[PDB]
Amino acid sequence: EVEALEKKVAALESKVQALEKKVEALEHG
Amino acid sequence: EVEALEKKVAALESKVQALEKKVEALEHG
Amino acid sequence: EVEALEKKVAALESKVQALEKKVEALEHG
Numbered sequence: 001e002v003e004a005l006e007k008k009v010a011a012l013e014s015k016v017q018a019l020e021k022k023v024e025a026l027e028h029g
Numbered sequence: 030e031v032e033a034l035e036k037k038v039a040a041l042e043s044k045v046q047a048l049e050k051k052v053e054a055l056e057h058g
Numbered sequence: 059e060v061e062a063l064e065k066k067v068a069a070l071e072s073k074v075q076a077l078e079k080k081v082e083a084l085e086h087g
Contacts, residue, residue: 001031002059008038009066015045016073022052023080030060037067044074051081 001035002063005031005034005038005063006059008042009063009070012038012041012045012070013066015049016070016077019045019048019052019077020073022056023077026055026084027080030064034060034063034067037071041067041070041074044078048074048077048081051085055084
């Protein structure tokens with residue numbers, strides 16, 4: 001379970017960093 | 030702790046998938 | 059590893075809540 005959580009968490013961090021930048025282009029900055 | 034992390038991670042995946050689509054309507058696609 | 063996952067997950071929840079609100083200003087609401 002821990003290794004599985006590790007993969008899910010790494011994927012989420014990747015998606016969230018991309019989302020953060022996408023939105024940054026639309027507002028604030 | 031692991032089960033608790035599992036629930037938090039599943040919730041985040043759900044929120045991130047919805048956010049991804051919301052933003053998709055605004056930009057690229 | 060578990061404590062490390064805890065920190066990554068807490069950070070993600072924080073970022074996702076902020077993103078959710080940012081986007082809310084742009085669409086639906």
